[PDB]
Motif scaffolding. Structure first.
Motif, PDB file in Angstrom:
ATOM      1  N   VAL B   1      27.093  46.626  38.453  1.00 14.14           N
ATOM      2  CA  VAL B   1      28.174  47.109  37.611  1.00 14.14           C
ATOM      3  C   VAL B   1      27.785  46.992  36.159  1.00 14.14           C
ATOM      4  CG1 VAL B   1      29.921  46.638  39.310  1.00 14.14           C
ATOM      5  CG2 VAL B   1      29.275  44.898  37.711  1.00 14.14           C
ATOM      6  N   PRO B   8      35.792  47.979  41.088  1.00 14.55           N
ATOM      7  CA  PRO B   8      35.904  48.991  42.141  1.00 14.55           C
ATOM      8  C   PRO B   8      36.492  48.423  43.423  1.00 14.55           C
ATOM      9  CG  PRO B   8      33.616  48.382  41.702  1.00 14.55           C
ATOM     10  CD  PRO B   8      34.420  47.851  40.585  1.00 14.55           C
TER      11      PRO B   8
ATOM     12  N   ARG F  31      24.924  45.500  45.152  1.00 12.55           N
ATOM     13  CA  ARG F  31      25.953  46.440  45.564  1.00 12.55           C
ATOM     14  C   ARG F  31      27.309  46.007  45.033  1.00 12.55           C
ATOM     15  NH1 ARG F  31      24.713  49.269  49.739  1.00 12.55           N
ATOM     16  NH2 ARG F  31      22.511  49.703  50.149  1.00 12.55           N
ATOM     17  N   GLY F  32      27.908  46.833  44.196  1.00  6.56           N
ATOM     18  CA  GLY F  32      29.269  46.574  43.765  1.00  6.56           C
ATOM     19  C   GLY F  32      29.318  45.459  42.759  1.00  6.56           C
ATOM     20  N   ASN F  33      30.267  44.551  42.942  1.00  5.61           N
ATOM     21  CA  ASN F  33      30.535  43.472  42.005  1.00  5.61           C
ATOM     22  C   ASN F  33      29.648  42.277  42.225  1.00  5.61           C
ATOM     23  OD1 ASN F  33      32.981  44.995  41.178  1.00  5.61           O
ATOM     24  ND2 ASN F  33      33.738  44.310  43.172  1.00  5.61           N
ATOM     25  N   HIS F  40      26.393  38.794  36.512  1.00  8.25           N
ATOM     26  CA  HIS F  40      27.366  39.610  35.811  1.00  8.25           C
ATOM     27  C   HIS F  40      28.443  38.761  35.175  1.00  8.25           C
ATOM     28  CE1 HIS F  40      25.968  42.888  38.705  1.00  8.25           C
ATOM     29  NE2 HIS F  40      25.527  43.214  37.505  1.00  8.25           N
ATOM     30  N   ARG F  41      28.170  37.470  34.995  1.00  4.99           N
ATOM     31  CA  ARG F  41      29.170  36.563  34.455  1.00  4.99           C
ATOM     32  C   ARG F  41      29.609  37.003  33.079  1.00  4.99           C
ATOM     33  NH1 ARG F  41      31.060  31.055  33.605  1.00  4.99           N
ATOM     34  NH2 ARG F  41      30.651  30.312  35.729  1.00  4.99           N
ATOM     35  N   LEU F  43      29.755  39.988  31.853  1.00  7.01           N
ATOM     36  CA  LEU F  43      30.642  41.130  32.025  1.00  7.01           C
ATOM     37  C   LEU F  43      32.020  40.698  32.496  1.00  7.01           C
ATOM     38  CD1 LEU F  43      30.796  44.232  32.107  1.00  7.01           C
ATOM     39  CD2 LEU F  43      29.911  44.091  34.374  1.00  7.01           C
ATOM     40  N   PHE F  44      32.077  39.926  33.577  1.00  9.70           N
ATOM     41  CA  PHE F  44      33.375  39.597  34.150  1.00  9.70           C
ATOM     42  C   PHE F  44      34.190  38.694  33.246  1.00  9.70           C
ATOM     43  CE2 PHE F  44      33.702  41.034  38.595  1.00  9.70           C
ATOM     44  CZ  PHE F  44      32.555  41.772  38.622  1.00  9.70           C
ATOM     45  N   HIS F  48      36.946  41.337  31.955  1.00 10.39           N
ATOM     46  CA  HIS F  48      37.960  41.099  32.981  1.00 10.39           C
ATOM     47  C   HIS F  48      38.333  39.628  33.023  1.00 10.39           C
ATOM     48  CE1 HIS F  48      37.137  45.151  34.604  1.00 10.39           C
ATOM     49  NE2 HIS F  48      35.886  44.862  34.299  1.00 10.39           N
ATOM     50  N   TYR F  51      39.770  37.084  36.289  1.00 12.54           N
ATOM     51  CA  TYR F  51      39.508  37.739  37.565  1.00 12.54           C
ATOM     52  C   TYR F  51      39.508  36.741  38.712  1.00 12.54           C
ATOM     53  CZ  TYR F  51      37.501  40.756  41.061  1.00 12.54           C
ATOM     54  OH  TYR F  51      37.280  41.483  42.202  1.00 12.54           O
ATOM     55  N   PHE F  52      38.794  35.631  38.552  1.00 11.68           N
ATOM     56  CA  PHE F  52      38.528  34.713  39.649  1.00 11.68           C
ATOM     57  C   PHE F  52      39.594  33.633  39.737  1.00 11.68           C
ATOM     58  CE2 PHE F  52      34.276  36.230  38.476  1.00 11.68           C
ATOM     59  CZ  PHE F  52      33.891  36.746  39.684  1.00 11.68           C
TER      60      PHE F  52
ATOM     61  N   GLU G 173      43.924  39.560  37.698  1.00 13.36           N
ATOM     62  CA  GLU G 173      43.448  39.060  36.413  1.00 13.36           C
ATOM     63  C   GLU G 173      44.529  38.256  35.695  1.00 13.36           C
ATOM     64  OE1 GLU G 173      41.891  42.302  34.259  1.00 13.36           O
ATOM     65  OE2 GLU G 173      40.123  42.527  35.530  1.00 13.36           O
ATOM     66  N   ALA G 175      44.023  34.547  36.468  1.00 12.48           N
ATOM     67  CA  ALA G 175      43.680  33.202  36.927  1.00 12.48           C
ATOM     68  C   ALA G 175      42.785  32.450  35.949  1.00 12.48           C
ATOM     69  CB  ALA G 175      43.022  33.282  38.302  1.00 12.48           C
ATOM     70  N   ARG G 176      41.560  32.916  35.757  1.00 10.33           N
ATOM     71  CA  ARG G 176      40.544  32.122  35.074  1.00 10.33           C
ATOM     72  C   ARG G 176      40.087  32.860  33.828  1.00 10.33           C
ATOM     73  NH1 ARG G 176      35.563  32.855  34.895  1.00 10.33           N
ATOM     74  NH2 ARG G 176      34.116  31.265  34.113  1.00 10.33           N
TER      75      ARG G 176
END
Ligand SMILES: [Mg+2]
Ligand SMILES: [Mg+2]
Ligand SMILES: [Mg+2]
Ligand SMILES: [Mg+2]
Ligand SMILES: [Mg+2]
Ligand SMILES: [Mg+2]
Ligand SMILES: [Mg+2]
Ligand SMILES: [Mg+2]
Ligand SMILES: [Mg+2]
Ligand SMILES: [Mg+2]
Ligand SMILES: [Mg+2]
Ligand SMILES: [Mg+2]
Ligand SMILES: [Mg+2]
Ligand SMILES: [Mg+2]
Ligand SMILES: [Mg+2]
Ligand SMILES: [Mg+2]
Ligand SMILES: [Mg+2]
Ligand SMILES: [Mg+2]
Ligand SMILES: [Mg+2]
Ligand SMILES: [Mg+2]
Ligand SMILES: [Mg+2]
Ligand SMILES: [Mg+2]
Ligand SMILES: [Mg+2]
Ligand SMILES: [Mg+2]
Ligand SMILES: [Mg+2]
Ligand SMILES: [Mg+2]
Ligand SMILES: [Mg+2]
Lengths: 126, 103, 234, 142, 51, 144, 186
Positions: B1, B8, F31-33, F40-41, F43-44, F48, F51-52, G173, G175-176
């Motif tokens: 990504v 997604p 693949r994917g996320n 990708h830390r 990025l997330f 976003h 997210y977690f 989105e 949580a953390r």
RNA sequence: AAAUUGCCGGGAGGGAAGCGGAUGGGGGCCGGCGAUGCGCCCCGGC
RNA sequence: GGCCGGUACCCGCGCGCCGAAAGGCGUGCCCCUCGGGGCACUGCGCUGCAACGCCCUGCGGGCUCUCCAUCCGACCCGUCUUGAAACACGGACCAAGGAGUCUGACAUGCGUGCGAGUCGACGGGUUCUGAAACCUGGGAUGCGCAAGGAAGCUGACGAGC
RNA sequence: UAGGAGGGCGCGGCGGCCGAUGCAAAACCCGGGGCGCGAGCCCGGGCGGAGCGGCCGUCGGUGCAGAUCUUGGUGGUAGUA
């Protein structure tokens, strides 16, 4: 039927721009393809190697598309579109298209003689 | 990504190309249903083409509680008080729903 | 009809108004050329007056026992002699500020501690010195271009100056030449008006550009000899 | 044209049945317009025979000697195609053809734009008929 | 009723005239040029004609 | 419109526009996320946030019907009454609006009201809707 | 060799003709080309440059803001190169004269029934070619929902940008990175 | 159709050939490759 | 002496004469005062530099086509690479097939329609070449018009510089 | 160079418009003539013997010199081992 162009036609290059290495191979056609190599002597433009087409080789806009006749060519398929060059015969030249019949060519050439239109194909297919 | 985009949710990790359902037969079902409706109308001539009668009832569910719709059938209480016997009501074009309750 | 006669009425009005503007401007030019004539006469007169005045003063000082120190030059002509390749970025900026952005360009410079210490920083790339009247005037005539509306308009007629200047009491080429050479109250504008002189390559050659003019080369001060160089750059 | 002339032009400036375009869309493009009532057959809004209320045509007539038709569109009858053009079959000699064309094009302020071009086409049509009558007596090359 | 007067006048670049040795143009740039030249020549006249 | 895709202009340029040095292989990042917490830390946790992880308490078998409160601001109420029955009114006589007939449950209090009184008849009201209606001279009738 | 950036050729871009091949818009473009060329009115210049705009640079302007802008200026003709949408939140609209590209069919009826006159840009060019007594306007550009997502990243301090989320809820989105009790507060 | 081979006619060759820029020498091919028409006049009828 | 240019504007020509012509010729005011010099009143128009050759179906002219010679240049392309002519790898040659497409979600940008709405997409009625087209519902289906909380719940009282 | 964008050239369909064709279409060959900087296009001649092109909109299994690429053919090696 007298040319209107009053400026000498100047061409900065008459030789064609043949593809690099069209000579060593047969499968490569003569038509130009820009060499995309990373080590290509043609792309790096070392002296002694083929010249590429630039925009700098362009010809004058006011002497562009003039034949050696000093007329711009216009391809006609029939009498109907032959007759619309009445007021361009000093600057436009008819060429009867390559796939007409000899019968229709006689008619177009007869019509063009009386409309006084220069034609470069009046000795074609006879 | 990569650059800022939604996370997604592609649910295409199975063999979905074996279960794609295409709708090219949509005009075909339209026309076939139309044909079936003509040949039922001619058979049940001169019965009403919508079928038997249906009750005004309320929907469930706070979202639609106020919005009346056609139900499934008249209750036994309703048939009795309108003077139409149980076993005869479905005969003459009146649905019967023994499961509803009149509240 | 009414449409075309109404068009033609204004066409007539504009014809007359244009003619009367031409009639006014003929008188304007006819008087302006005498004004220019007067200004150029007096500029020349003070050129010889100053030139005799320097000799008068120096002779008088020798006569009276001491000596006269000439007044250090107010004006520099700088001409770049090294190309745009392999430049320290600070030097690249210095040249972009001096308006020497191509080899063999010439600019006129005020002398002052702000700008001469700016040349100090970039001497390996310029040759510069003290222009005199012939050099300045014939640069302005034969290679004169004006920064007019960001375009480089050739200074082939007196009218360009009416547009570039005229809020500064500079009307002809000779006003521009004087007001540069004798560094005037408007020299900034009458130089920023000028476009960097795009000069010829030095006829007869050029000494080594690697070294300074003192050591044998060409960069740096050649105070009086930019005059000697200009006649072969131009 | 029920709609105005400028709008008709913006509608048909890129494709129409009477437009003959060849040699692609590059700098080589050659454009003519072959409707009957365009004089130079140059495809421009000045000469366009479809985007204009006031258009003039100068054509050799049907099979018959030395008869020229000069036609001008009637501006007011414009939504009536059968009665849309005033056609004028004249068969006199050239000087009296030129005076009448000036009468019908320039002198009444019908459309002075096409004063010179209409006459030039009249010269061309007239001499075309003249040589269809006589023959090729002159090579016409000096 | 509001447009400024139409401007059909096309001003092309003017051919260059030698600003140092073309008499016609140097007298439009520096009208005093002829007077200075005459003064210099008429001053040389005596300086030679004396001896 | 494949005649427009920029792949067509990248014909003849050996790399089809994906670089010579760093090539275009299958999935060089996963693949994917893949690797949200690992590579990708950046990025997330830049684009976003949040997210977690779990927040809040679960709610088994939610029906969206249970949570249905269509709302209308006060500012739009007067659009609901037609101009004729806005005319058939005066200082003491005001139209009555059943929002439930319009599909609204709650009447929220955003915006201006005309000085003309109005009797809005809703299922739910806010504090501020009432304060604005009273201050405008109307009243509230709670029904369901 | 001369020391210039990209040979001096301008590296910025702007529209010089609308991407839209709407013939009516092209005709307005020709008209205002004529006007800005022969008239030298800065108002015509701005109008031209704003016909050369996209629909995200021509946001709608509703009457609840147009009336604000016309409150006490009924002599001057309102110009909005864009769209006029109605706004059922206003009640009394002064009879105003507004020129625009489009009028939502309910807003045009609102204006007509209020007694103003509802113009297009050619009718504007009739009785204000140089723009006498005109009031140029623009709708709210950064009010678009997409703009709520732009600026510095959602997950950096002091940024109040909406992050792209496929649905609102507790699980999406929160949580953390959005509270102290799970990680940190953005 | 090309790759490739043969025959006929031409051309050139001191351990490569091919290609770019100059013309030069051979060829082969181009009559829109390159014109003879305008004005003034006098009949002789059209 | 070289190269370029040959004119609708700068030049230049006519509206007087003499002069084949370069060109000379008027009046009035200032300067030296010889020789002459400077200045001046200024208007309509028009405004693509010329002379003479050579050849004209020729054994002519010129050609961007072909071959050959000569001078200069010139390593074999694609590629991974800081670096390829490399003693790095693939390629004997030809012909045909041959490699960022389709679908889902999302997003920015642009165009169109409508615009606090907007979608007719599942159905229904029609549909005389038609899997098309046209009509229909929606009073709440999707998204949007309200958000903050985990949740119970509450839910924008009207902006100045 | 990696890369990005704009304007165009070209192949094959579909909806339209203008045409050509047994007095010779398509294709292919040419020391033939040209146009464009170039992709490419136009004309001439030959074989060919029945179809084809141009413009606008639009669509796509759309452009080859390489992939020890795939299928088919052909060479030098060689009249050699
Ligand atoms: Mg490299
Ligand atoms: Mg799988
Ligand atoms: Mg020398
Ligand atoms: Mg040296
Ligand atoms: Mg060094
Ligand atoms: Mg590239
Ligand atoms: Mg890419
Ligand atoms: Mg690669
Ligand atoms: Mg990468
Ligand atoms: Mg790497
Ligand atoms: Mg780890
Ligand atoms: Mg340069
Ligand atoms: Mg923190
Ligand atoms: Mg062969
Ligand atoms: Mg040997
Ligand atoms: Mg060679
Ligand atoms: Mg040769
Ligand atoms: Mg290595
Ligand atoms: Mg090695
Ligand atoms: Mg390897
Ligand atoms: Mg190998
Ligand atoms: Mg809705
Ligand atoms: Mg403010
Ligand atoms: Mg493919
Ligand atoms: Mg292929
Ligand atoms: Mg191949
Ligand atoms: Mg390749």
């Amino acid at each position: 039927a007298v040319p209107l162009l009053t400026r000498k036609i100047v061409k900065k290059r008459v030789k064609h721009f043949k593809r690099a290495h069209s000579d060593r191979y047969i499968g490569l056609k003569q038509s130009w393809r820009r060499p995309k190599g990373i080590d290509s002597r043609v792309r790096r433009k070392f002296k002694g190697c083929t010249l590429m087409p630039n925009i700098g080789y362009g010809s004058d806009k006011k002497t562009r598309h003039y034949l050696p006749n000093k007329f711009k060519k216009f391809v006609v398929h029939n009498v109907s579109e032959l007759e619309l060059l009445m007021m361009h015969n000093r600057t436009y030249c008819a060429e009867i298209a390559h796939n007409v019949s000899t019968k229709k060519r006689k008619d177009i050439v007869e019509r063009a003689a009386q409309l006084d239109i220069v034609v470069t194909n009046k000795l074609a297919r006879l | 990504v990569k650059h800022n985009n939604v996370i997604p949710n592609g649910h295409f990790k199975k063999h979905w190309q074996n279960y794609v359902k295409t709708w090219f037969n949509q005009p075909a079902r339209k026309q076939r249903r139309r044909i079936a409706r003509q040949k039922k109308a001619v058979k049940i001539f001169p019965r009403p083409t919508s079928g038997p009668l249906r009750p005004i009832v309320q929907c469930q569910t706070r979202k639609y509680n106020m919005k009346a719709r056609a139900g499934r059938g008249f209750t036994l209480e309703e048939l009795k008080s309108a003077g139409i016997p149980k076993k005869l009501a479905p005969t003459i074009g009146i649905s019967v729903d023994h499961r509803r309750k009149n509240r | 009809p009414e449409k075309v006669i109404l068009k033609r009425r204004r066409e007539e009005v504009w014809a007359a108004e244009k003619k009367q503007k031409v009639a006014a401007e003929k008188i304007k030019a006819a008087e302006n050329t005498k004004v220019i004539y007067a200004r150029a006469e007096q500029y020349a007169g003070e050129y010889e007056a100053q030139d005799k005045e320097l000799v008068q003063l120096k002779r008088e000082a020798r006569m009276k026992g001491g000596f006269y120190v000439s007044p250090e030059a107010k004006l520099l002509f700088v001409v770049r002699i090294r190309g745009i390749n392999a430049m320290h970025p600070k030097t690249k900026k210095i040249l972009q500020l001096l308006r020497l952005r191509q080899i063999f360009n010439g600019v006129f410079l005020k002398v002052n501690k702000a700008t001469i210490n700016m040349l100090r920083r970039v001497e390996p790339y310029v040759a510069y010195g003290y222009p005199n009247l012939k050099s300045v005037r014939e640069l302005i005539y034969k290679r004169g271009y004006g920064k007019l509306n960001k375009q480089r308009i050739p200074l082939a007629n007196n009218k360009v100056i009416e547009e570039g200047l005229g809020k500064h009491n500079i009307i002809c080429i000779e006003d521009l030449v004087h007001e540069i050479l004798t560094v005037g109250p408007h020299f900034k504008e009458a130089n920023n008006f000028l476009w960097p002189f795009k000069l010829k390559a030095p006829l007869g050659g050029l000494k080594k550009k690697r070294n300074h003019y003192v050591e044998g080369g060409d960069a740096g001060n050649r105070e009086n000899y930019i005059n000697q160089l200009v006649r072969r750059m131009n | 044209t029920t709609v105005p002339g400028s709008l008709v032009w913006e509608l048909v400036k890129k494709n129409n049945c009477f437009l003959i375009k060849q040699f692609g869309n590059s700098n080589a493009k050659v454009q003519f317009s072959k409707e009957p009532n365009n004089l130079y057959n140059v495809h421009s809004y000045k000469f366009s025979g479809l985007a204009n209320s006031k258009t003039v045509a100068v054509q050799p007539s049907a099979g018959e000697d030395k008869a020229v038709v000069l036609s001008t569109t009637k501006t007011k009858k414009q939504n009536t195609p059968a009665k849309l053009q005033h056609k004028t079959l004249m068969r006199k000699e050239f000087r009296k053809m030129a005076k009448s064309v000036k009468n019908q094009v320039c002198d009444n302020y019908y459309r002075p734009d096409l004063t010179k071009p209409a006459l030039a086409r009249l010269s061309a049509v007239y001499r075309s008929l003249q040589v269809s009558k006589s023959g090729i007596k002159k090579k016409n090359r000096q | 009723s509001v447009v400024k007067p139409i401007n059909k006048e096309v001003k092309r670049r003017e051919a260059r005239k030698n600003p140092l040795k073309n008499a016609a143009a140097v007298l439009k740039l520096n009208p005093y040029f002829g007077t200075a030249r005459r003064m210099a020549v008429l001053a040389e006249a005596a300086r030679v004609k004396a001896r | 419109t494949t005649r427009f895709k920029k792949n067509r202009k990248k014909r003849g340029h050996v790399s089809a526009g994906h670089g010579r040095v760093g090539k275009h292989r299958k999935h060089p990042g996963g693949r994917g996320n893949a690797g949200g917490m690992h590579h990708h830390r950046i990025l997330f946790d830049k684009y976003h946030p949040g997210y977690f992880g779990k927040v809040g308490m679960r709610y088994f078998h939610k029906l969206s019907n249970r949570f249905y409160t269509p709302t209308v601001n006060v500012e739009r109420l007067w659009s609901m009454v037609p101009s004729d029955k806005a005319a058939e009114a005066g200082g003491d006589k005001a139209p009555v609006v059943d929002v439930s007939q319009f599909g609204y449950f709650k009447v929220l209090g955003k915006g201006m009201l005309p000085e003309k009184p109005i009797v809005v008849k809703a299922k739910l009201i806010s504090k501020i809707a009432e304060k604005k209606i009273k201050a405008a001279g109307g009243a509230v009738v709670l029904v369901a | 060799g001369i020391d210039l950036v990209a040979g001096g050729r301008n590296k910025r871009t702007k529209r010089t003709a609308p991407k839209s091949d709407d013939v009516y818009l092209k005709l307005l473009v020709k008209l205002y080309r004529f006007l800005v060329r022969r008239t030298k009115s800065q108002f015509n210049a701005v109008i031209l440059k704003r016909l050369f705009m996209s629909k995200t640079n021509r946001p709608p302007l509703s009457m609840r803001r147009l009336v604000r802008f016309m409150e006490g200026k009924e002599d001057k003709i309102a110009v909005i190169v864009g769209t006029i949408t109605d706004d059922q939140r206003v009640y009394e609209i002064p009879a105003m004269k507004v020129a625009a590209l489009r009028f939502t069919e309910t807003a045009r009826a609102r204006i007509v029934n209020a007694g103003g006159e509802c113009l297009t840009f050619d009718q504007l060019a009739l009785r204000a070619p140089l723009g006498q007594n005109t009031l140029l306007l623009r709708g709210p550009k950064n009010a678009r929902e997409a703009v709520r997502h732009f600026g510095k990243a959602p997950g950096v301090p002091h940024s109040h940008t909406k992050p792209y989320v496929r649905s609102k809820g507790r699980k999406f989105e929160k949580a953390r990175g959005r509270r102290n009790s799970r990680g940190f507060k953005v």
